[PDB]
Design a protein around this ligand. Structure first.
Ligand SMILES: Nc1ncnc2c1ncn2[C@@H]1O[C@H](COP(=O)(O)OP(=O)(O)O)[C@@H](O)[C@H]1O
Ligand SMILES: [Mg+2]
Ligand SMILES: [Mg+2]
Length: 288
């Protein structure tokens, strides 16, 4: 049993795990099911997370309903979600059904557009941080690395598989573009069931991106040369693999949308809102 500011919660089964604690299923005194994310320098990270979550009230963003403070641990109380996208991809090793890719991508874009409109960047979008409930609603979660505009950035070993090439090259500037890259990586992962850029080491990351989309050309994107790592490193020059080989047989409008998400120049990359209005979503009800 745990006492919050809003209600009392009865601990049930462990429904997840994490770097600083365990996520459990839980029950309200009145019966309503919830999630308890237990958090063990670390209290500052949890405080940031709560403050950002309290600014983000949207159907496509995991709802924070309460906080339990204990000398030992900070417990976040969320609406319950049955699964996550990593778990969904594990059951579909060769990709998802086309209608589902379309549903999940639209909701992922809508949640991110809400973030961006509220001047917050997620910065850690990946299938395990994309929660899916018992009704198929996709919601953003884990705002642990989120960045509010104008607030300075303040370390855990995480995957660089969804990180934008300019960020991996040392860019530190605030850009909504960093999230759209991750969305592109996720979009491609939902098509094949496999990660688009799974570099073997943190060092292999940029050569892995470049091996698929080509090595960026400074005449096309002049600002590459201005980036820190581009100055202190030499990269093997690659030609872009055709989309016909990356995502074989996927619809033309989906390939066009993906290509606008995965372009190197952050100033040319499609925004979350413009991507929602792309011909690829023509048939989809926006009121989902
Ligand atoms: N609202 C929720 N409902 C159910 N399970 C959840 C919920 N939030 C998180 N989880 C589960 O536990 C993991 C929680 O870790 P997360 O929220 O991403 O924190 P972290 O990765 O920082 O430790 C998730 O990836 C998921 O498997
Ligand atoms: Mg996480
Ligand atoms: Mg965390």
């Amino acid at each position: 049993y745990f006492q919050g500011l809003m209600e009392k919660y009865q601990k049930l089964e462990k429904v997840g795990e994490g770097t600083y604690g365990v996520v459990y299923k839980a029950k309200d005194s009145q019966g309503r099911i919830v999630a308890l994310k237990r958090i063990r320098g670390i209290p500052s990270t949890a405080i940031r997370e709560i403050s950002l979550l309290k600014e983000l009230h949207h159907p496509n963003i995991v709802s924070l309903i309460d906080v339990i403070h204990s000398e030992r641990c900070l417990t976040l109380v969320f609406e319950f979600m049955e699964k996550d996208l990593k778990k969904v991809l594990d059951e579909n090793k060769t990709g998802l059904q086309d209608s589902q890719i379309k549903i999940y991508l639209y909701q992922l874009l809508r949640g991110v557009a809400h973030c961006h409109q509220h001047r917050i960047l997620h910065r850690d979008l990946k299938p395990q941080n994309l929660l899916i409930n018992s009704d198929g609603a996709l919601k953003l979660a884990d705002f642990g690395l989120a960045r509010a505009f104008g607030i300075p950035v303040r370390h855990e070993v995480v995957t660089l598989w969804y990180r934008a090439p300019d960020v991996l090259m040392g860019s530190k500037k605030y850009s909504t573009s960093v999230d759209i890259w991750s969305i592109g990586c996720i979009f491609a992962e939902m098509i094949t069931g496999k990660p688009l850029f799974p570099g073997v080491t943190d060092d292999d990351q940029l050569p892995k991106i470049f091996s698929i989309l080509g090595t960026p050309n400074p005449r096309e994107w002049p600002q590459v040369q201005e980036l820190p790592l581009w100055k202190q490193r030499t990269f093997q020059v690659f030609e872009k693999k055709p989309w016909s080989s990356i995502i074989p047989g996927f619809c033309q409008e989906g390939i066009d949308l993906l290509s606008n998400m995965l372009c190197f120049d952050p100033n040319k990359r499609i925004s979350a809102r413009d991507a929602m209005n792309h011909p690829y979503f023509k048939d989809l009800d926006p009121q989902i």
